[PDB]
Curated annotation (Swiss-Prot):
This is Beta-phosphoglucomutase. Changing K76A: 100-fold reduction in the conversion of beta-G1P to G6P in the presence of beta-G1,6bisP. Pfam families: Hydrolase (PF00702). The record marks S114, K145 as: Important for catalytic activity and assists the phosphoryl transfer reaction to Asp8 by balancing charge and orienting the reacting groups. Belongs to the HAD-like hydrolase superfamily. CbbY/CbbZ/Gph/YieH family. Its cofactor is Mg(2+). Beta-D-glucose 6-phosphate binds at D10, G46, V47, R49, S116, K117, N118.
Length: 218
């Protein structure tokens, strides 16, 4: 039997991508740049501030200083942090709380393997800290996803190998990072996005303990 589950935060446990989008949208406006919508935001999604800002600045040929590019990148970060202050337990995805409880009661270790720099904060605010044995610190890991480093750290931090674990993810980079750690991925989303060589549920309601068990035995 699997001895742990390693959780992605965004798109599995909750939606942090909504607040990111509004921070970049807000900045776009307060500058005068046009048309930062949700379709465009798919270019900003798994990418660092610098490139995101570069793409947002190219929508109107806007040239910036440097002591200004630094500032504009900092405004988006200040704004994201304002906006996530209202994350509540009411934002926990369906079936996640119940899965975590069933996991705590069956003595399966629970670890976070998210890119997010606000991971513990977001878990406090949603009232899920009690369930997690460890949180992978993405500043301590040398490389990001699709590298397997954050899933390895996540397992190690709860005293297991990746191969004793299942990873929960919603992105192709995330799936490939679970795969290279040696963990068993179970996707959330479309196999058009994530791949038909792995097991995927439509949404997080379908992440049950019983289902997780059936997948391991297969
Ligand atoms: Mg994700």
């Amino acid at each position: 039997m699997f001895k742990a589950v390693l959780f992605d935060l965004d798109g599995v446990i909750t939606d942090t991508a909504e607040y990111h989008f509004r921070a970049w949208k807000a900045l776009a406006e307060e500058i005068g740049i046009n048309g930062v919508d949700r379709q465009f935001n798919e270019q900003l999604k798994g990418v660092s501030r610098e490139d995101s800002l570069q793409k947002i600045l190219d929508l109107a040929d806007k040239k910036v200083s440097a002591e200004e590019f630094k500032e504009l990148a900092k405004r988006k970060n200040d704004n994201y942090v304002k906006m996530i202050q209202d994350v509540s337990p009411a934002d926990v995805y369906p079936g996640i709380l119940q899965l975590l409880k069933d996991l705590r009661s069956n003595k399966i270790k629970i670890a976070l393997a998210s890119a997010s720099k606000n991971g513990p904060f977001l878990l406090e605010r949603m009232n899920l800290t009690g369930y997690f044995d460890a949180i992978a610190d993405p500043a301590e890991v040398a490389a990001s996803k699709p590298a397997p480093d954050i899933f390895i750290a996540a397992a190690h931090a709860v005293g297991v190998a990746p191969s004793e674990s299942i990873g929960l993810e919603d992105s192709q980079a995330g799936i490939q990072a679970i795969k290279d750690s040696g963990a068993l991925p179970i996707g959330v989303g479309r196999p058009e996005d994530l791949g038909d060589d792995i097991v995927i549920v439509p949404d997080t309601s379908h992440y049950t303990l019983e289902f997780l068990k059936e997948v391991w035995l297969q």
